[PDB]
Swiss-Prot record:
This is Serine protease NS3. It is found in: Host cytoplasm; Host endoplasmic reticulum membrane. ATP binds at L12, H13, P14, G15, A16, G17, K18, T19. The record marks R274, R277 as: Involved in NS3 ATPase and RTPase activities. The modification N6-acetyllysine is found at K207. Residues 150-329 form the Helicase C-terminal domain. It is a peripheral membrane protein.
């Protein structure tokens, strides 16, 4: 696999041992052949699991999720998918790795799509080798792959709101359940209903993942309520998965605003990854998978692929050349390569609005391309009346950096800045000039 000019897709079924068995063998061979290597983890939790599988081997951990005293003799680096893309964008030299390994290469967040695009272009140019590790590569049509032990698959109606009757099977179970919901707010309602019935519930989402995941090992629990983030290598000691089969979809309207459409069906790749949380122990057959809807190709026209093109257009590759998206996922967006390329000063603002400002890629692009500097927050207050942000069914209010109380009304509206209580609190701090 390690030979230059080659991209290999390691597609063994979920639980086959790609991370703990195959990955250390690849690393040993790359070290023997003196190949400068990079290993890409989707989250900080998976990075910690990788250190346990690679313990003893000379690997340089470029993350604070691991506490190691590095010897300085390493030719293998390990970092998260988002860290790789961030360093490419910033004015810091990233080595031209001979071997590029991506674990959980099915991750559809914008920085993961960008990393696949950049790596596959280098391979196509005859410069590097690459290995994409996932049971569900882009374009998969099989929601029910093989597992370590048989799974009981049942199509059933799954509640998406609090309930009084009709779903006895949910609370009559005596094991442990991992329940996938379409959003943070939807999960809050189901958690409240279960807690009222005497159940012990843990909630997981992108912003709380590392902290709350530790609770699954440190305390007794009956249910885990989670968004699609737990599709990226999160492991649990459970015997049942409840899957709504629904997700939210960011959509750009008239190139003017971003809305969160849905809930709508998940892809076959997501359904297989959600199902893949159970049936992992070969000695424990009979884990249950309850699913409440069908699959569809909802990644076509999804804003993450447009945002990935915005990142790739602002990454240096060679003179005026721009990296393409990974071939099996390129038709998900209607975009001309190079149309989002910014000049030096606007690019610097774009990077800082994402890195320090914590704004979504699309929103960061509108501000930077309009010629506005990072600290200038006048655009958060001069939008039209129909862009007013609502807090508890009443217009949200902030004190500006000048000391004036103003209604939050952004020139560009992106629904992700107010999708939950935590997101709106962080966007209020940005509008006030607090970061
Ligand atoms: C380590 C681990 N992973 N998943 C589960 C479940 C556990 C057990 N944790 C409990 C915590 C409370 C005391 C007993 C041990």
């Amino acid at each position: 696999m390690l030979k230059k000019k080659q991209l290999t897709v390691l597609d063994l079924h979920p639980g086959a041992g790609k991370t703990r068995r195959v990955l250390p063998e690849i690393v040993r061979e790359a070290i023997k052949k003196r190949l400068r290597t990079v290993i890409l983890a989707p989250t900080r939790v998976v990075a910690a699991e990788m250190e346990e599988a690679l313990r003893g081997l000379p690997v340089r951990y470029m993350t604070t999720a691991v506490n190691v005293t590095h010897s300085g003799t390493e030719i293998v680096d390990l970092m998260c998918h988002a860290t790789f893309t961030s360093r490419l964008l910033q004015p810091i030299r990233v080595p031209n790795y001979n071997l590029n390994i991506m674990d959980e290469a099915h991750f559809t967040d914008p920085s993961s799509i960008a990393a696949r695009g950049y790596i596959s272009t280098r391979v196509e140019m005859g410069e590097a080798a690459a290995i994409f590790m996932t049971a569900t590569p882009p374009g998969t049509r099989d929601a029910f792959p093989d597992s370590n032990s048989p799974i009981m698959d049942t199509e059933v109606e799954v509640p998406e709101r609090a309930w009084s009757s009709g779903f006895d099977w949910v609370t009559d179970h005596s094991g442990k359940t991992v329940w996938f919901v379409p959003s943070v707010r939807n999960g809050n309602e189901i958690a409240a209903c279960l807690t009222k019935a005497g159940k012990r519930v843990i909630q997981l989402s992108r912003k709380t993942f590392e902290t709350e995941f530790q609770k699954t090992k440190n305390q007794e629990w009956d249910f885990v309520i989670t968004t699609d983030i737990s599709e990226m290598g999160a492991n649990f000691k459970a015997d049942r998965v409840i899957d709504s089969r629904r997700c939210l979809k960011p959509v750009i309207l008239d190139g003017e605003r971003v809305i969160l459409a849905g809930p709508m069906p998940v892809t076959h790749a997501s359904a297989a990854q959600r199902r893949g949380r159970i049936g992992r122990n070969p000695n424990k057959p009979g884990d249950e998978y309850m699913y409440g809807g069908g699959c569809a190709e909802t990644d076509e026209g999804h804003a993450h692929w447009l945002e990935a093109r915005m990142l790739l257009d602002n990454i240096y590759l060679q003179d005026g050349l721009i990296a393409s998206l990974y071939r099996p996922e390129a038709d998900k967006v209607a975009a001309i390569e190079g149309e989002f390329k910014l000049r030096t000063e606007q690019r610097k603002t774009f990077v800082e609005l994402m890195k320090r400002g914590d704004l979504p890629v699309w929103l960061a692009y509108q501000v930077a391309s309009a010629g506005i500097t990072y600290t200038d927050r006048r655009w958060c207050f001069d939008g039209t009346t129909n862009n007013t942000i609502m807090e508890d069914s009443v217009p949200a209010e902030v004190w500006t950096k000048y000391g004036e109380k103003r209604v939050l009304k952004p020139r560009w509206m992106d629904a992700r800045v107010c999708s939950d209580h935590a997101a709106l609190k962080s966007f209020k701090e940005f509008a006030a000039g607090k970061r």
